[PDB]
Write an enzyme that holds these catalytic residues in place. Sequence first.
Site, PDB file in Angstrom:
ATOM      1  N   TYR A 180       0.861  -1.173   0.000  1.00 52.87           N
ATOM      2  CA  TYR A 180       0.000   0.000   0.000  1.00 52.87           C
ATOM      3  C   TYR A 180       0.903   1.230   0.000  1.00 52.87           C
ATOM      4  CZ  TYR A 180      -3.874   3.202   0.627  1.00 52.87           C
ATOM      5  OH  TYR A 180      -4.764   4.247   0.451  1.00 52.87           O
TER       6      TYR A 180
ATOM      7  N   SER B 122      -5.178   0.779  -5.367  1.00 57.93           N
ATOM      8  CA  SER B 122      -5.432   2.149  -4.912  1.00 57.93           C
ATOM      9  C   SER B 122      -4.070   2.854  -4.774  1.00 57.93           C
ATOM     10  CB  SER B 122      -6.210   2.108  -3.588  1.00 57.93           C
ATOM     11  OG  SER B 122      -6.682   3.382  -3.247  1.00 57.93           O
ATOM     12  N   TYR B 123      -3.739   3.426  -3.612  1.00 60.19           N
ATOM     13  CA  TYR B 123      -2.394   3.978  -3.430  1.00 60.19           C
ATOM     14  C   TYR B 123      -1.340   2.907  -3.734  1.00 60.19           C
ATOM     15  CZ  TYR B 123       1.229   7.280  -2.005  1.00 60.19           C
ATOM     16  OH  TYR B 123       2.336   8.115  -2.007  1.00 60.19           O
TER      17      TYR B 123
ATOM     18  N   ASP C  65     -15.477   3.855 -11.156  1.00 61.57           N
ATOM     19  CA  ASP C  65     -14.681   4.324 -10.034  1.00 61.57           C
ATOM     20  C   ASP C  65     -14.826   5.846  -9.924  1.00 61.57           C
ATOM     21  OD1 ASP C  65     -12.773   4.804  -8.023  1.00 61.57           O
ATOM     22  OD2 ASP C  65     -11.490   3.153  -8.711  1.00 61.57           O
TER      23      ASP C  65
ATOM     24  N   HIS D  25     -14.325   1.761  -6.856  1.00 59.22           N
ATOM     25  CA  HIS D  25     -12.994   1.597  -6.265  1.00 59.22           C
ATOM     26  C   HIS D  25     -12.851   0.315  -5.472  1.00 59.22           C
ATOM     27  CE1 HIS D  25      -9.049   3.224  -5.856  1.00 59.22           C
ATOM     28  NE2 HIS D  25      -9.077   3.264  -4.534  1.00 59.22           N
TER      29      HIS D  25
END
Lengths: 728, 728
Positions: free
Chosen positions: B509, B592-593, B670, B702
């Site tokens: 992450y 995501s990140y 998203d 998402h």
Amino acid sequence: TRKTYTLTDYLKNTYRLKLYSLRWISDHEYLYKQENNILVFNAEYGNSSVFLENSTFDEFGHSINDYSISPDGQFILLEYNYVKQWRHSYTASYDIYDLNKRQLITEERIPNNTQWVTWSPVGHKLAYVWNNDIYVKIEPNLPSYRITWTGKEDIIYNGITDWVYEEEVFSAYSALWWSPNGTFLAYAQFNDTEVPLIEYSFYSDESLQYPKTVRVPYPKAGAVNPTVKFFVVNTDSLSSVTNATSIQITAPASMLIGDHYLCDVTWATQERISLQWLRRIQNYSVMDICDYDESSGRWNCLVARQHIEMSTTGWVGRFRPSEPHFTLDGNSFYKIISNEEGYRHICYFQIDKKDCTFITKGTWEVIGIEALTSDYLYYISNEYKGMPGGRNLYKIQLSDYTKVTCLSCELNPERCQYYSVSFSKEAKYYQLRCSGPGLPLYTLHSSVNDKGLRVLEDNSALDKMLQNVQMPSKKLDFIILNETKFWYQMILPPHFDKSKKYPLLLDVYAGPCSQKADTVFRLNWATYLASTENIIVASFDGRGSGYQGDKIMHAINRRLGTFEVEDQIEAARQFSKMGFVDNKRIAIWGWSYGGYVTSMVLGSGSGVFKCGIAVAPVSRWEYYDSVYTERYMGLPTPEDNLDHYRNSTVMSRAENFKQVEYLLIHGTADDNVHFQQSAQISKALVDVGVDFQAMWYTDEDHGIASSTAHQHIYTHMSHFIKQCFSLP
Amino acid sequence: TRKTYTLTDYLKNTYRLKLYSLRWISDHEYLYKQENNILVFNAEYGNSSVFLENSTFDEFGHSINDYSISPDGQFILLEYNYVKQWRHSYTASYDIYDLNKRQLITEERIPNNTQWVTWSPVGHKLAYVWNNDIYVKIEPNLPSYRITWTGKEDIIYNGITDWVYEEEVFSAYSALWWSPNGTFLAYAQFNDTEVPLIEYSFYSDESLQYPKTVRVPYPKAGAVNPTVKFFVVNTDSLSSVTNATSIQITAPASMLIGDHYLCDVTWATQERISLQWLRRIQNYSVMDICDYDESSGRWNCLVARQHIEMSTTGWVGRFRPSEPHFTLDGNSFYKIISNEEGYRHICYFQIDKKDCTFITKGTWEVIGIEALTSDYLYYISNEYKGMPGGRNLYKIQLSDYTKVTCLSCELNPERCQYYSVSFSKEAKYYQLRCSGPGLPLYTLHSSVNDKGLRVLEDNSALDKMLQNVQMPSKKLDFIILNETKFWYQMILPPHFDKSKKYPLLLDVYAGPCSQKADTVFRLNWATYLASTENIIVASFDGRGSGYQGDKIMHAINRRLGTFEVEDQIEAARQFSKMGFVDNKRIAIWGWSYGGYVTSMVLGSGSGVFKCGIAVAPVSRWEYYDSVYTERYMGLPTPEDNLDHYRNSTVMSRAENFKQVEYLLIHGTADDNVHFQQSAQISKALVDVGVDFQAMWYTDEDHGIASSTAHQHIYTHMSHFIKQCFSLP
Ligand SMILES: *[C@@H]1O[C@H](CO)[C@@H](O[C@@H]2O[C@H](CO)[C@@H](O)[C@H](O)[C@H]2NC(C)=O)[C@H](O)[C@H]1NC(C)=O
Ligand SMILES: *[C@@H]1O[C@H](CO)[C@@H](O[C@@H]2O[C@H](CO)[C@@H](O)[C@H](O)[C@H]2NC(C)=O)[C@H](O)[C@H]1NC(C)=O
Ligand SMILES: *[C@@H]1O[C@H](CO)[C@@H](O[C@@H]2O[C@H](CO)[C@@H](O)[C@H](O)[C@H]2NC(C)=O)[C@H](O)[C@H]1NC(C)=O
Ligand SMILES: *[C@@H]1O[C@H](CO)[C@@H](O[C@@H]2O[C@H](CO)[C@@H](O)[C@H](O)[C@H]2NC(C)=O)[C@H](O)[C@H]1NC(C)=O
Ligand SMILES: *[C@@H]1O[C@H](CO)[C@@H](O[C@@H]2O[C@H](CO)[C@@H](O)[C@H](O)[C@H]2NC(C)=O)[C@H](O)[C@H]1NC(C)=O
Ligand SMILES: *[C@@H]1O[C@H](CO)[C@@H](O[C@@H]2O[C@H](CO)[C@@H](O)[C@H](O)[C@H]2NC(C)=O)[C@H](O)[C@H]1NC(C)=O
Ligand SMILES: *[C@@H]1O[C@H](CO)[C@@H](O[C@@H]2O[C@H](CO)[C@@H](O)[C@H](O)[C@H]2NC(C)=O)[C@H](O)[C@H]1NC(C)=O
Ligand SMILES: *[C@@H]1O[C@H](CO)[C@@H](O[C@H]2O[C@H](CO)[C@@H](O)[C@H](O)[C@H]2NC(C)=O)[C@H](O)[C@H]1NC(C)=O
Ligand SMILES: *[C@@H]1O[C@H](CO)[C@@H](O[C@H]2O[C@H](CO)[C@@H](O)[C@H](O)[C@H]2NC(C)=O)[C@H](O)[C@H]1NC(C)=O
Ligand SMILES: CS(=O)(=O)c1ccc2c(c1)nc1n2C[C@H](N)[C@@H](c2cc(F)c(F)cc2F)C1
Ligand SMILES: CS(=O)(=O)c1ccc2c(c1)nc1n2C[C@H](N)[C@@H](c2cc(F)c(F)cc2F)C1
Ligand SMILES: *[C@@H]1O[C@H](CO)[C@@H](O)[C@H](O)[C@H]1NC(C)=O
Ligand SMILES: *[C@@H]1O[C@H](CO)[C@@H](O)[C@H](O)[C@H]1NC(C)=O
Ligand SMILES: *[C@@H]1O[C@H](CO)[C@@H](O)[C@H](O)[C@H]1NC(C)=O
Ligand SMILES: *[C@H]1O[C@H](CO)[C@@H](O)[C@H](O)[C@H]1NC(C)=O
Ligand code: NA
């Protein structure tokens, strides 16, 4: 050991077909671009001069995209700032260069963002469309006359087509037509007010912070269609009256009773125009023939001159009703129409007699009428050797129909079986373009004696190159199913050995009136797959395919997603029977309508195919446009054909995809087959737990044709096919 | 030989963690749903009664989503017709059932499509938001008083948050705050008038002929932000005849000078509210403490009671400035803030004194303040054994800060190193939730002598099931980079053999304040990969990670896509030199990140990773939302941080992807990380001719969390990883 024809060869165009693109400017001269110069050629003797030196526009400060000489050779229209829109449409900037003064014109310039421009057929008048309105310039340096005031982006289109008329009706952005000597300008006006919009994102360069939503008036099947009106203005009156009247020609009552289309506009004489209208149910068409009335200033269409063209078995025309070809006096015309046996042949009409006379006949079809003189009609057909996938030029004596000469058949029968032609202005000369089965060959001929004048381009350079390459071969043949011949072609690996079992890729289109089995020479992806990867690449023309009569073409009427799909499966079974095909390694692929058929086949449960690739497929007929879809399917209503619309979707077969390897590919900016179509496929496959491969192409349209994306897709598909076929 | 933990086990939830989700209703009792019957428990003895029978709503007619009992126990709020919006927002229908007269209220019902509803904290008043306006009901059967009239979809939000405030500031859709006894209702109003809209297609069910365009006000980095106002209304002086008067509390002048946010609202007493405001440049925040003036009916916020919180090294707070915890008289409060060493500790403030006193200290951090009495403050921290990824409950004696007692450390040191807590109304009892490294363990305790009253749920059923599965282990340890310890975890295959080489997947992450190395027990995709596929799944917490002080956390300030990416490469480099790791088979993935970091790593040219998967990645910081992005990055202007916004994109690294296998995945709906971000990645890879694998998920957001899409994505990713590692 000679190299093979590799993927990089294909993607880098290392083996290039030479062309000979000329532009007739008269009955005996043509323009030809050589080394960025424009040369003018004398057809009779083959000698040339420089028309426009390559360095003429060095200090122009823009890259010129294209050029257009005025009919009288006095001016050249320079096209730059080319921005593509749909298949035919685009916008551009335009300058006019005065040839006799050798000066660019600087006053009263054609505006930027012009949508369409055309010279009058004679002299140097211009009509253009800008912000959806029509303008006429009588002289290149003088002010324009505005013709329409109603133009409105996405709403009212004067002199240009909307999306669906461009793609499905006219195959052009232009919707204006000069009369033969340029006195009148005819034009259509499209009203898209209640036509729904397709909306999709366009991402653009990475600098764009928020994506753009592209919004296009696009009628999907059964939706509200654009309405249309037709007008003629007298351009000779423009300098005499403040605001010249556009005289409307209204559709006949038989069209006005319901939704309809304008499907053809053809001038017959200086004061006579013909219009064809088509009912939204596209099995009934009406031609009006309208004369200028000098005393009223109106246009009248005598019912005695009205011609009905209808079909009991399918739709009218191949993709639309055919165009008429008028005799000089405009009192008669020739038209390709389906005869009593369902074969398309030339019919000869008197303008005020309802029964025509067929001047050609037989179990083969006329492809197009190419030229008409006082003595002869010239046409292309597939008559030669009963080969529907061949094309030859013929000449018929108008005073004696039994006198039919094949002009191209025997020129080089081994090398050349597919011809198109380009006649000079009054048909004094013709350029023949042979496109296969050997290397393309371009030749010039005189009509007075039908003698060959010279070879223009013979592709000897390419021949020399290809000698050092293990090229594949091409077989064109037929199989008999249910007492009917159905044609197929195979791209066969070099050194093809019938005693071996080859992997087979079925290359599919199979849309209505399609033809994938022909005599054309191609250097493409199949060439690499056969040459380098030793894959047989096959195509088959089954029920619904064109150029073989209506019994075959209309077999899929009201029933897309049936026989044309089944026949591809059957074709693959027949190819297995031939004994050189590895039954464990049969694949299928197609683009567009071919992507739909590929997906339908892969979802059939047939067990025949290991894997397949659909690119930009239709998935459900209600998602595709009205004009094309309804021509074959009728309306998606309970009272018409909704049941078959709902029965012929890819999504309903999702569960059967568990048996195959599938690759689904679509450009995100496809304005034609909306990304929606593949979005619904992927979701249906997700919903039944089917694993598949996917690839989107950001900002690519139906062509996936940008240089980088084209190379990327074929590279991606090659890995997929090779993996499927266990090829290292 | 016993089974492994398989992909189907993960996907079908074969091995379920049991929970014990209770709701404290007083200092002595809680509610617990058991077999659809709501029971009330006595905390001291553990005896219970049926509070509400499951059969009560047998003929209700709707599937009930959730319930909410009024604080006084007289009413139950029934939630149904739930329709999800963003991460926290949704709309629903509501009914109120009278628990004493055993009947549904049919008069003056809460409307359908209600956006938020909440009981007052005492009694049974209701505040709800419907069509962006606030309403109050004093009694469930009585007419509502309309509080606000300016509500307007996508423009004016009263008592609910817009997209960015929901996601980034409040982590809730609610923007309503009742005073402690329900007299006052405070609320925020958001104005998004000039906030640009993200637009994207939603395809819906197959039946939808034209896709829908979803339009959401969403400020990307540097764009126009929503504005905010704050009001308090007296719900005791509402009138049927006159519209309600809301009193505005304006932001301090230090905020009004430019763009700013409301970031915290916390009532101190019946007549004292605190608000924290944050500058758009998020290194300066201000708390106002505002008092009700009974004679003027105004709220006054004395400047002597202002508290400034700023940062010289980064932004303020972990993701926002922390909440204050007020004493009973509201004359003082406790708040976690970064100390002079950059470690987050509890500071004690007097409302009208500038200097606070730190009551905790050391090289570890307080995670949260959990309860406050006149004698003790209860907090969670990672002090125990200096393990940043462990969590324990402590209490500190307010009269002697040297007296700190760990309340959970020694309960079960082997099973339990990560706790959260739920205290009863006046902190008489607490529930501890142990979530690892062993199976979750739920226990109840009384505060007076910290007796361990009883075990509520020990997951012994799961324990018995897992005895017959070959489960992976978890190693939690550290490596030293540049004299600093950075922690990692490895999910190790069953029967781990340090003399064998295993493939390694780096699970990333790595966002600011993230922590991926911890003592939590998880049954996830990594469990399957380790147990069934014999893959080590590793995670590393490098620069930018949380809970270890600002020296580490703020290392990436103004510089995302730098050190946190470099440190993942370094960890992998180190792991690859360990004897049990196959350096030829190291992969990376993240969502995501983590998708952004995975993509930056794979574009780094490091040569360490064979393959990777990015799911819904950020690709360019200018595409992500202002509040999150600017917190770390400042503004994308030449004068601020534009250069680093421009060279921290995935797209600029496209060429480096040539030597890796990449799988890029993204849901088309998203709303958070727009599909745009992956669309720009794929286009960049196409442009440099890099082949890669792709998957879009139609209409997924998402979370890609629908049941079918969730199974599909993990299935597709598992094939990709296995293929990459040559695993059958
Ligand atoms: C091709 O050559 C012909 C024939 O020489 C050119 O035609 C004219 O030839 C006569 C000779 O009697 C001269 O008066 C002129 O030089 C030519 N004038 C014209 C009509 O062009 C002709 O110019 C040549 N064509 C091209 C395109 O170069
Ligand atoms: C294009 O068609 C639309 C109908 O869809 C015409 O718009 C109507 O115009 C009349 C005025 O004559 C109004 O009373 C209606 O309100 C309009 N209808 C709609 C749906 O807008 C429009 O005039 C046509 N435009 C042209 C130039 O022909
Ligand atoms: C030229 O004539 C056309 C057709 O008569 C004019 O178009 C009309 O303009 C009026 C007022 O602007 C509208 O009420 C009509 O609906 C229009 N009809 C059409 C066919 O567009 C046009 O405005 C005239 N131009 C000039 C310069 O007078
Ligand atoms: C092009 O054709 C038009 C239409 O026939 C010609 O215009 C007519 O000319 C005749 C003279 O023979 C007149 O009687 C009419 O008044 C004209 N009609 C119209 C509608 O304008 C025109 O002269 C021809 N142009 C050229 C260059 O020959
Ligand atoms: C929430 O929606 C329902 C359904 O629209 C409303 O309840 C009634 O439902 C019946 C059919 O289910 C309809 O005939 C009525 O129009 C609805 N209203 C009445 C008069 O009761 C319900 O009213 C809505 N809830 C609220 C409080 O507005
Ligand atoms: C909740 O607190 C409010 C504010 O302190 C109370 O309202 C006040 O009650 C006193 C009675 O002693 C009145 O004299 C004040 O005028 C009230 N102030 C306001 C602002 O209304 C309220 O009574 C408390 N409610 C409960 C249930 O304890
Ligand atoms: C809050 O952060 C900003 C940006 O880092 C600091 O303001 C100045 O930023 C400009 C460029 O953005 C630089 O020229 C200065 O170096 C920064 N200020 C200084 C250190 O003089 C601002 O200082 C920060 N605020 C606090 C409270 O530290
Ligand atoms: C748990 O046990 C207590 C005491 O044994 C219960 O009894 C108390 O409250 C009842 C009403 O709820 C009364 O019937 C009892 O007289 C009263 N006993 C005393 C002396 O406190 C209590 O209710 C039980 N709690 C629950 C939730 O069932
Ligand atoms: C919400 O904010 C807008 C500003 O973003 C307020 O409208 C103002 O700004 C308009 C431009 O969009 C100006 O033309 C107006 O002068 C100004 N006020 C008016 C009359 O709209 C708007 O009022 C705000 N709405 C609320 C309820 O606060
Ligand atoms: C031979 S023709 O009259 O020039 C003609 C005119 C129009 C034609 C065409 C041939 N072939 C197509 N079209 C338009 C049509 N939209 C084309 C098409 C069909 C599909 F089913 C499709 F999915 C995409 C697509 F672009 C194929
Ligand atoms: C710990 S917390 O204060 O509750 C908190 C509040 C908000 C938080 C968060 C933690 N973690 C995230 N967010 C909001 C943020 N939009 C989240 C996020 C970050 C990204 F970089 C991203 F690409 C997507 C995404 F959803 C991560
Ligand atoms: C076309 O646009 C260019 C650049 O904006 C401008 O300089 C030129 O004047 C334009 N031409 C016309 C005919 O308006
Ligand atoms: C046109 O098609 C419809 C639908 O098949 C049919 O009912 C109608 O009779 C057809 N018209 C002609 C002229 O055959
Ligand atoms: C309350 O305010 C609204 C909107 O400003 C107004 O329309 C309404 O009539 C008001 N009601 C009373 C009782 O004044
Ligand atoms: C003009 O075209 C190109 C340069 O653009 C050059 O190669 C060629 O030689 C020139 N034409 C002539 C005079 O041959
Ligand atoms: Na106990």
